[PDB]
Amino acid sequence: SETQHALGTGVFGGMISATILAIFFVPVFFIFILGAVEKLF
């Protein structure tokens, strides 16, 4: 069980975090990163 547990726990948590947060953060990241270059112009 332990060998499976170690492999599964990290990926489970990471996928949950990168799913729930990403859908809400990626838009902001893209908008502000592109606005940086927009301001530079």
């Binding site: 726990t9 990168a18 592109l34």
Partner: protein, 394 residues
């Protein structure tokens, strides 16, 4: 702030190499003082068998008397104990090893240590950490043992170490006869005469082969058992002399008792002693290694250490993880830039990885599993998955 907090989450949580596994068997190593005979090892092994007789969770346990890892002699033994299938079993091998260790610590004639199977195929002969204590300033063989004793004394109190021991044959005593040349010369007996009686006093001599049922079988001659037991037999050996009066060794040699290590070990070309230990529960292997490194820092100058076996691989894996992660992130960034013909698109995708890292670290913290290789593989996979969502959007 999320990135900042996950940074420390990676940095500070303990680390280990491989999860421990219950494989249905364990090893018990019996070590008696250097003065022990076969009978005492037999008695301790019988008591061990007596303890393991009444447990229905054990299929059988075999003991090899006279043989053991890290040394072979009359004071060593190894017992292989195998357990019944998992379903019938109600206790893991760790609990049984703890029970055996406690029972033998209660009353035995020596040191006996129950160890789980090694995690990797051939990385050591047991589970835990193995260390080689070397003498790096030519302090001297006697002083290395004193330093080792200091190390055990200071490491016994530590919580992080369930139990730590020396993996090797202990010190002992030896009778070193001193042959006086001029005594033999004056008495007239040749020195070769006194040499050849000691040579054949208790050694084994081979002569030739005889056929037994058509099979060649050696012919071995040895002084009867009764005559090679105490110092009297060697001390009383009589050799004919020129004067016509037999002279025993007692008149012509001097018995001298001395204390010397029985076994000499070297590691990387420099005299050394092996030491083994088991990481205590609630403490990862890496934490135990760091603690023992700090303990070694306190020993007298000239005593150094090195990690051999699974410990060195664990340290190497711990070291190279940062470079592996950095190279993976750079590769993904370059691939994204190449595929999307822009320099700002990839950065948005890359910034998402910390989000997955916060949640991988959180999960491992919540269950409490120590950081290990599988955790790094999971991190690498989540990098790609988060990049795969950020790509889908961007």
């Amino acid at each position: 702030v999320i990135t900042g907090i996950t940074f420390a989450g990676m940095k500070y949580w303990p680390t280990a190499f491989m999860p421990e596994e219950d494989q249905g068997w364990f090893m018990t190593s019996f070590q008696l003082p250097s003065d022990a005979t076969a009978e005492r090892t037999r008695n301790v092994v019988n008591q061990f068998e007596n303890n393991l007789k009444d447990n229905p969770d054990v299929k059988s346990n075999t003991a090899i008397l006279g043989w053991g890892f890290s040394g072979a002699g009359q004071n060593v033994a190894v017992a292989f104990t195998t357990l019944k299938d998992f379903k019938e079993r109600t206790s893991s091998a760790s609990k049984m090893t703890s029970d055996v260790n406690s029972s033998m610590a209660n009353s035995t004639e020596g040191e006996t240590m129950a160890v789980l199977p090694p995690a990797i195929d051939e990385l050591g002969t047991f589970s835990g950490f193995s260390l080689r204590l070397q003498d790096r300033a030519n302090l001297g063989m006697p002083a290395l043992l004193a330093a080792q004793d200091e190390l055990m004394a200071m490491a016994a109190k530590n919580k992080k170490f369930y139990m730590v021991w020396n993996e090797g044959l202990p010190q002992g005593d030896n009778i070193s006869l001193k042959i006086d040349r001029e005594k033999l010369s004056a008495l007239g007996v040749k020195f070769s005469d006194v040499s050849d009686i000691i040579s054949t006093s208790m050694g084994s001599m081979y002569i030739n082969d005889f056929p037994n049922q058509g099979r060649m079988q050696q012919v071995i001659v040895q002084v009867e058992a009764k005559s090679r037991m105490q110092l009297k037999d060697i001390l009383n050996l009589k050799v004919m002399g020129s004067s016509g009066q037999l002279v025993s060794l007692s008149e012509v040699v001097t018995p001298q008792w001395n204390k010397a290590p029985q076994q000499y070990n070297r590691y990387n070309g420099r005299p050394s002693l092996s030491i083994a230990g088991i990481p205590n529960f609630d403490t990862s292997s890496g934490e135990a290694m760091r603690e023992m490194e700090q303990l070694i820092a306190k020993l007298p100058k000239g005593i150094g250490y090195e990690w051999t076996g699974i410990s060195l691989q664990e340290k190497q894996s711990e070291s190279q993880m940062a470079f592996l992660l950095g190279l993976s992130m750079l590769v993904v960034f370059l691939v994204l830039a190449a595929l999307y013909e822009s320099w700002a698109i990839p950065l948005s995708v890359m910034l998402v990885v910390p989000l997955g890292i916060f949640g991988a670290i959180i999960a491992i913290m919540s269950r409490g599993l120590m950081n290990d290789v599988f955790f790094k593989i999971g991190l690498i996979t989540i990098i790609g998955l988060s990049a795969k969502n950020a790509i889908l959007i961007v």
